[PDB]
Design a protein around this ligand. Structure first.
Ligand SMILES: NC(=O)c1ccc[n+]([C@@H]2O[C@H](COP(=O)([O-])OP(=O)(O)OC[C@H]3O[C@@H](n4cnc5c(N)ncnc54)[C@H](OP(=O)(O)O)[C@@H]3O)[C@@H](O)[C@H]2O)c1
Ligand SMILES: Nc1nc(=O)c2nc(CNc3ccc(C(=O)N[C@@H](CCC(=O)O)C(=O)O)cc3)cnc2[nH]1
Ligand SMILES: [Mn+2]
Ligand SMILES: [Mn+2]
Ligand SMILES: [Mn+2]
Length: 159
């Protein structure tokens, strides 16, 4: 099973200038809980944005060019990325925009955080078709001293 996890600001913005400009510790904690002990697939730009391997996860990087760091696994195609994960119950695709586009048709589950923030951005989450997806979990949180925007954790499963 392939799942996508992402945090979306208004208008599906996910990034600007190879960064995420907001800071929502509660959402990073949610990201860690839902990805720990699973393989994570990311594109090369997202690897450069994170800047280090994510501990406790098999890190698989998509790039058309040879890898430059043996602490992670480098692959050259979507099919190779999937194969490099082995026989696991759940593969997590962690972006960015161009990677999410390619894996969306193959995904059974989306873990989405909707952030009440307006962000100028240059990268968006793919338009998906709402009729294809059932919301099975949602949890709203107001802003607090640690998280400066309200946010909504949602899990959707392909119908
Ligand atoms: N809010 C969130 O949830 C979230 C999550 C992740 C990322 N982001 C943001 O998203 C932005 C980065 O997204 P992006 O769309 O620019 O880039 P990306 O999807 O992270 O990376 C694109 C790169 O991945 C490689 N790639 C993708 N598909 C491939 C394929 N089929 N075969 C081989 N290589 C492939 C290519 O690398 P080469 O050029 O080396 O061939 C391509 O240039 C940043 O702003 C980041 O902060 C946000
Ligand atoms: N919901 C969601 N939020 C995100 O921030 C997110 N980020 C990415 C890609 N970028 C990043 C950037 C930083 C870290 C990071 O530092 N993660 C630590 C945080 C642990 C914690 O704060 O509790 C990790 O171990 O996962 C992960 C992914 C992909 N999907 C996402 N999905
Ligand atoms: Mn092929
Ligand atoms: Mn197999
Ligand atoms: Mn806000």
């Amino acid at each position: 099973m392939i799942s996508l996890i992402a945090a979306l600001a208004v208008d599906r913005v996910i990034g600007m200038e190879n960064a995420m400009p907001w800071n929502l510790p509660a959402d990073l904690a949610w990201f860690k809980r839902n990805t720990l002990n699973k393989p994570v697939i990311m594109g090369r730009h997202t690897w450069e944005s994170i800047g280090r391997p994510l501990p406790g996860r098999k890190n698989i990087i998509l790039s058309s060019q040879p890898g430059t760091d043996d602490r992670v696994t480098w692959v050259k195609s979507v099919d190779e990325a999937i194969a490099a994960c082995g026989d696991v119950p759940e593969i997590m695709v962690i972006g960015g925009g161009r990677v999410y586009e390619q894996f969306l048709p193959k995904a059974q589950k989306l873990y989405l955080t909707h952030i009440d923030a307006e962000v100028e951005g240059d990268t968006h989450f793919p338009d998906y078709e709402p009729d294809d997806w059932e919301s099975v979990f949602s949890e709203f949180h107001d802003a607090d001293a640690q998280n400066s925007h309200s946010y909504c954790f949602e899990i959707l499963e392909r119908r």
